[PDB]
Swiss-Prot record, chain A:
The keyword Ribosomal protein applies. Belongs to the eukaryotic ribosomal protein eL22 family. It is found in: Cytoplasm. Its main location: cytoplasm. Keywords: Cytoplasm, Ribonucleoprotein, Ribosomal protein. The gene is RPL22A. Component of the large ribosomal subunit (LSU). Mature yeast ribosomes consist of a small (40S) and a large (60S) subunit. The 40S small subunit contains 1 molecule of ribosomal RNA (18S rRNA) and 33 different proteins (encoded by 57 genes). The large 60S subunit contains 3 rRNA molecules (25S, 5.8S and 5S rRNA) and 46 different proteins (encoded by 81 genes). GO terms for biological process: cytoplasmic translation. Present with 60400 molecules/cell in log phase SD medium. It comes from Saccharomyces cerevisiae (strain ATCC 204508 / S288c) (Baker's yeast). This is Large ribosomal subunit protein eL22A. GO terms for molecular function: RNA binding; structural constituent of ribosome. Component of the ribosome, a large ribonucleoprotein complex responsible for the synthesis of proteins in the cell. The small ribosomal subunit (SSU) binds messenger RNAs (mRNAs) and translates the encoded message by selecting cognate aminoacyl-transfer RNA (tRNA) molecules. The large subunit (LSU) contains the ribosomal catalytic site termed the peptidyl transferase center (PTC), which catalyzes the formation of peptide bonds, thereby polymerizing the amino acids delivered by tRNAs into a polypeptide chain. The keyword Ribonucleoprotein applies.
UniProtKB/Swiss-Prot annotation, chain B:
Gene3D superfamilies: 2.20.25.30. The gene is RPL43A. Pfam families: Ribosomal_L37ae (PF01780). A zinc finger (C4-type) spans 38-59. Keywords: Cytoplasm, Metal-binding, Phosphoprotein, Ribonucleoprotein, Ribosomal protein, Zinc, Zinc-finger. This is Large ribosomal subunit protein eL43A. It is found in: Cytoplasm. InterPro entries: Ribosomal_eL37/eL43, Ribosomal_eL43, Ribosomal_protein_eL43, Ribosomal_zn-bd. The modification Phosphoserine is found at residue 39. It comes from Saccharomyces cerevisiae (strain ATCC 204508 / S288c) (Baker's yeast).
From Swiss-Prot, chain C:
Component of the large ribosomal subunit (LSU). Mature yeast ribosomes consist of a small (40S) and a large (60S) subunit. The 40S small subunit contains 1 molecule of ribosomal RNA (18S rRNA) and 33 different proteins (encoded by 57 genes). The large 60S subunit contains 3 rRNA molecules (25S, 5.8S and 5S rRNA) and 46 different proteins (encoded by 81 genes). The lineage of its organism: Eukaryota, Fungi, Dikarya, Ascomycota, Saccharomycotina. The keyword Ribosomal protein applies. Gene3D superfamilies: 3.30.720.90. This is Large ribosomal subunit protein eL38. It comes from the Eukaryota. Belongs to the eukaryotic ribosomal protein eL38 family. The gene is RPL38. GO terms for cellular component: cytoplasm; cytosol; cytosolic large ribosomal subunit. GO terms for biological process: cytoplasmic translation; protein-RNA complex assembly.
UniProtKB/Swiss-Prot annotation, chain D:
InterPro entries: Ribosomal_eL39, Ribosomal_eL39_CS, Ribosomal_eL39_dom_sf. GO terms for cellular component: cytoplasm; cytosol; cytosolic large ribosomal subunit. Component of the ribosome, a large ribonucleoprotein complex responsible for the synthesis of proteins in the cell. The small ribosomal subunit (SSU) binds messenger RNAs (mRNAs) and translates the encoded message by selecting cognate aminoacyl-transfer RNA (tRNA) molecules. The large subunit (LSU) contains the ribosomal catalytic site termed the peptidyl transferase center (PTC), which catalyzes the formation of peptide bonds, thereby polymerizing the amino acids delivered by tRNAs into a polypeptide chain. Residues 1-21 are annotated as: Disordered. The keyword Ribonucleoprotein applies. It comes from Saccharomyces cerevisiae (strain ATCC 204508 / S288c). This is Large ribosomal subunit protein eL39. It comes from the Eukaryota. PANTHER family: LARGE RIBOSOMAL SUBUNIT PROTEIN EL39, RIBOSOMAL PROTEIN L39E. Component of the large ribosomal subunit (LSU). Mature yeast ribosomes consist of a small (40S) and a large (60S) subunit. The 40S small subunit contains 1 molecule of ribosomal RNA (18S rRNA) and 33 different proteins (encoded by 57 genes). The large 60S subunit contains 3 rRNA molecules (25S, 5.8S and 5S rRNA) and 46 different proteins (encoded by 81 genes). eL39 interacts with YIH1. Belongs to the eukaryotic ribosomal protein eL39 family. Residues 6-19 have a biased composition (Basic residues). It is found in: Cytoplasm.
Length: 100, 91, 77, 50, 112
RNA sequence: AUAUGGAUUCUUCACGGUAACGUAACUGAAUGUGGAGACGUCGGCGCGAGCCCUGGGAGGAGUUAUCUUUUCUUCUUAACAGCUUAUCACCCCGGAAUUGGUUUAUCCGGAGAUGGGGUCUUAUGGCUGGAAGAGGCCAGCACCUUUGCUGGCUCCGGUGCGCUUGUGACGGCCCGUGAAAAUCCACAGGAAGGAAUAGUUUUCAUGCCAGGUCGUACUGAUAACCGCAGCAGGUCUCCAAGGUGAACAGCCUCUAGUUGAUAGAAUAAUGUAGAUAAGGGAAGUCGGCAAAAUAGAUCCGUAACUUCGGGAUAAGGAUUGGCUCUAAGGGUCGGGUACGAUCAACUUAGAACUGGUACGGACAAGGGGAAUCUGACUGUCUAAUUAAAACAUAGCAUUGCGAUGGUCAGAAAGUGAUGUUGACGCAAU
RNA sequence: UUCAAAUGAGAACUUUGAAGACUGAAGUGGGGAAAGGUUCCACGUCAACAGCAGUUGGACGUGGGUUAGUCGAUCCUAAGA
RNA sequence: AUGGUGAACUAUGCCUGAAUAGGGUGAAGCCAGAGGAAACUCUGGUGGAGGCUCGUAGCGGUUCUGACGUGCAAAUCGAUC
């Protein structure tokens, strides 16, 4: 009835090209994903991590994968990186940052 | 809430045509739209259906009669006279 | 136009004289609410109607498929 | 038109057939005298009264 | 938004040119023409739409098995059952009273 | 055209159900009869479809100084078939005053209500078949090429005095009661024909062949038609998004479609079309011609006179933004034989705060009053100088006529209108 | 209405890209009846014609195009003939 | 004068089709209430009448005696109606 939802992002391809820092990126996530209102209310309701070259997001509160593409676009737009990196779905719910 | 002093159904016609003409019509409309007693089944369920044609809600009988009333006074007094005259020719 | 379920009544159709072609279609589908499974539709093209026999069971399916007339011209998928 | 009778299609046909310029080789015959096609007609200039 | 067009040449809204909108497997709206509706056959006796009898346009009745065109009992597809009940009774009684008026006026001819 | 299977038959031409009726079938000539085809208009109510609005998720897009779990967009299902589905109607049980049931709309019952239980029409909707293989949206590789190849996803909802259309059960209206025929079915009838060593049956199922002739392009109009023309005219119709608002109005937008109509430079007079003007306020003029004023809505107030229906938005007033609160008006479930729980709607009234006192802020949108003349009214006409007081009308009155007739037509006539007629009529003023 | 590129001997007027606007679903949208009769489409193309122009057109030249048992006609009947 | 051709405009009848935003008014019929010695009177709702009304499309054509008056046009255009 409650349900958990994981969400993967293969940040590899543009991380392995320097221009992407996963570091301050899950940072962008960890304090801007809003929960029934605002930022950092993730009261162990949602979690973010970085399997070296992956980001893992697991929600229990209202969180759609569209929201995920929405946040990162902001990050990407924030740090100039839009032009060079798409947020894309591959397999369902498993997303990846594409370079070129 | 009595709705008009006197024009009754004749209200539709408003002020047009003049009192007398409307008086006359109200009389005969009140005649035709009225619901009548059925001679055949006993229920008052005879309404009119075009000039002269009186038919019955349930039991579906149609009687020819007056243009705006079920029985015209004329035909009534005829009915009696045909009674009377028929009487003679069996007795 | 017609759908069928009596798995014998179908077998009779598959040998009903005018039946030259048949087709077997396989579909991924879900079960109740959780898992998925393997639906398989058996379609005998009659001269006047196209009959299709849904076999829900994957097991029933395989064994049914072998029984298909060895003269019948079946299109797989 | 839109949905015509054959009698009218037929006429219509024969009409477009006549709708050509002079074959230039007529201009070449001995004492040929026809200089152009004088009976040339054109849909938005002269209507063909059925 | 999406609009639509007639399919036959006739552009006018006549009874025989009823239209109806519809979404296709293409994912688009298209007109479809709708034949004028059947009306239920009527008891040619009392006049009610008579029961048990399927309802088509007249020629389409030749395209259907007889069990769509009758109910079992006498005057089946034809009159309204209750109507036949009347028929039966009235017939019986009248045929009887027939006999009673025979032997009554048969008595008179001998008693006078 | 026709066979195979099924059904039917030794009780020959099916059973079953009290019944309404059921069905895969279940012979049926002449003749008769019934239905369908087949029929006004308006009103509210009810329901369907498509549209509109909207939550969740799954994608692609746009904006990201700043803010927005965002803004846009995709998420679709044909005819046809199977099962199923209905307001109406009807049947069985039952016997009703303490009358009950009952629509928004007062109709129904001893000629059998309320009740409980069945039957039927299949509009319509549902689920499956068609049918995901199609179509829609993505992603990931390939190469001048034909252009591929590869995968994903294409799911679950909510709301209604909405819009348009369809339809049903009703109601209003008539000195108006709102085609025809082809064609298809059914019934009454029972002429005939038909089995036990084997008959009958193609209105059940399945199977075989065939469907000719002509039209199909495009325009349908500020350029494909008619106006001498690529003329500001004329010319029948269907489909119809978001906001504001009563609204298919006006004004702005999405889709689609245009961006066509000689062009440059100046900005005299006079013009044409759009506006404003201190103080006065019709003194202008044949005449307030023109123009200005008015306007929505809520509330309050409303004269003479009247055919009692009106006159009446009479007249005359106030009020109207934004924002923030408040109260009232609903739905669905389980309760032995008082309440609780949640879901979803803009309407209306009241109360604060707030501003250069503005608020129907554009758009939209009646000037009023007192009389005289004249036609009662709504309606009609001189297309292209007259729309009126002229015509018509209901109403009133007169005339002719009982068919071998009145009035009218024709050269005639075995001719014709009224006449599918009959004085409550037709004809004529 | 505007800026640019393309094309052409020639570009205010063609084509494409950009911008600014309009029609505002009672349409400058999507189809049809009557009427036209090839105007449709393609290629070529400017002597005349489109009351400036023209490389563009509903022009000029040259070709291509209209596929039905089920859509209409055909059948039926109306006033009437 | 004789013999002919017209009802594609328009007038009138007939036959078969089609079309008409949103408002205001609140007629018969019905429900419930109130007063009255009585006869009977009165109130609130419900309903949705009308060659009714406000007004678009539609049909029309009033005024400017407006535009135009070698016209867009041998009757049009605007605004008003
Ligand atoms: Mg012309
Ligand atoms: Mg949409
Ligand atoms: Mg068409
Ligand atoms: Mg109609
Ligand atoms: Mg049936
Ligand atoms: Mg039956
Ligand atoms: Mg049987
Ligand atoms: Mg008949
Ligand atoms: Mg009939
Ligand atoms: Mg008809
Ligand atoms: Mg069909
Ligand atoms: Mg019941
Ligand atoms: Mg029962
Ligand atoms: Mg309601
Ligand atoms: Mg409409
Ligand atoms: Mg009727
Ligand atoms: Mg029938
Ligand atoms: Mg014999
Ligand atoms: Mg058959
Ligand atoms: Mg033949
Ligand atoms: Mg076409
Ligand atoms: Mg055009
Ligand atoms: Mg000419
Ligand atoms: Mg024109
Ligand atoms: Mg166009
Ligand atoms: Mg010009
Ligand atoms: Mg100039
Ligand atoms: Mg002044
Ligand atoms: Mg003053
Ligand atoms: Mg004065
Ligand atoms: Mg003076
Ligand atoms: Mg004067
Ligand atoms: Mg004036
Ligand atoms: Mg002023
Ligand atoms: Mg007054
Ligand atoms: Mg206020
Ligand atoms: Mg509340
Ligand atoms: Mg107070
Ligand atoms: Mg008058
Ligand atoms: Mg008038
Ligand atoms: Mg005149
Ligand atoms: Mg004259
Ligand atoms: Mg007038
Ligand atoms: Mg005039
Ligand atoms: Mg007069
Ligand atoms: Mg008088
Ligand atoms: Mg003679
Ligand atoms: Mg230009
Ligand atoms: Mg605009
Ligand atoms: Mg509009
Ligand atoms: Mg245009
Ligand atoms: Mg077209
Ligand atoms: Mg043409
Ligand atoms: Mg050609
Ligand atoms: Mg072209
Ligand atoms: Mg030249
Ligand atoms: Mg030209
Ligand atoms: Mg020129
Ligand atoms: Mg030139
Ligand atoms: Mg050509
Ligand atoms: Mg047909
Ligand atoms: Mg034929
Ligand atoms: Mg005419
Ligand atoms: Mg209306
Ligand atoms: Mg109003
Ligand atoms: Mg109205
Ligand atoms: Mg009392
Ligand atoms: Mg009304
Ligand atoms: Mg009126
Ligand atoms: Mg009016
Ligand atoms: Mg208005
Ligand atoms: Mg007009
Ligand atoms: Mg008029
Ligand atoms: Mg003038
Ligand atoms: Mg002049
Ligand atoms: Mg004018
Ligand atoms: Mg007007
Ligand atoms: Zn009766």
């Amino acid at each position: 009835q409650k349900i958990a939802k994981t969400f993967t992002v293969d940040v590899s391809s543009p991380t392995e090209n320097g221009v992407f820092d996963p570091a301050s990126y899950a940072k962008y996530l960890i304090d801007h994903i809003k929960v029934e209102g605002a930022v950092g209310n993730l009261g162990n309701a949602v979690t973010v991590t970085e399997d070296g070259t992956v980001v893992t997001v697991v929600s229990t509160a209202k969180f759609s994968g569209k929201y995920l593409k929405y946040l990162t676009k902001k990050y990407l737009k924030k740090n100039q990186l839009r032009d060079w990196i798409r947020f894309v779905s591959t397999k369902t719910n498993e997303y990846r940052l594409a370079f070129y | 809430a009595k709705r008009t002093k006197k024009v009754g159904i004749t209200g539709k016609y408003g002020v047009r045509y003049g009192s007398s003409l409307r008086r006359q019509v109200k009389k005969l409309e009140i005649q035709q739209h009225a619901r009548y007693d059925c001679s055949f089944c006993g229920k008052k369920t005879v309404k009119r259906g075009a000039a002269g044609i009186w038919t019955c809600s349930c039991c579906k009988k149609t009687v020819a009669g007056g243009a705006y009333t079920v029985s015209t006074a004329a035909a009534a007094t005829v009915r009696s006279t045909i009674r009377r005259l028929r009487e003679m020719v069996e007795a | 136009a017609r759908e069928i379920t009596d798995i014998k009544q179908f077998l009779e159709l598959t040998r009903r004289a005018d039946v030259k072609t048949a087709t077997v279609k396989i579909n991924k589908k879900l079960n109740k609410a959780g898992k998925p499974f393997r639906q398989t539709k058996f379609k005998v093209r009659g001269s006047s109607s196209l009959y299709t026999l849904v076999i829900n069971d994957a097991g029933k399916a395989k064994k049914l498929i072998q029984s298909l007339p060895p003269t019948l011209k079946v299109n797989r998928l | 038109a839109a949905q015509k009778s054959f009698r009218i299609k037929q006429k219509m046909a024969k009409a477009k057939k006549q709708n050509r310029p002079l074959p230039q080789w007529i201009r070449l015959r001995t004492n040929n005298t026809i200089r152009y096609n004088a009976k040339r007609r054109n849909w938005r200039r002269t209507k063909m009264n059925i | 938004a999406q609009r639509v067009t007639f399919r036959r040449r006739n552009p006018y809204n006549t009874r025989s040119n009823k239209i109806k909108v519809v979404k296709t497997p293409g994912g688009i709206l298209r007109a479809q023409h709708v034949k004028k509706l059947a009306t239920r056959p009527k008891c040619g006796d009392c006049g009610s739409a008579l029961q048990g009898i399927s309802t088509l346009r007249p020629r389409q009745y030749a395209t259907v098995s007889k069990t769509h065109k009758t109910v079992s009992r006498a005057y089946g597809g034809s009159r309204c059952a209750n109507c036949v009940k009347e028929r039966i009774i009235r017939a019986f009684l009248i045929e009887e009273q027939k006999i009673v008026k025979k032997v009554v006026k048969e008595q008179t001819e001998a008693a006078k």
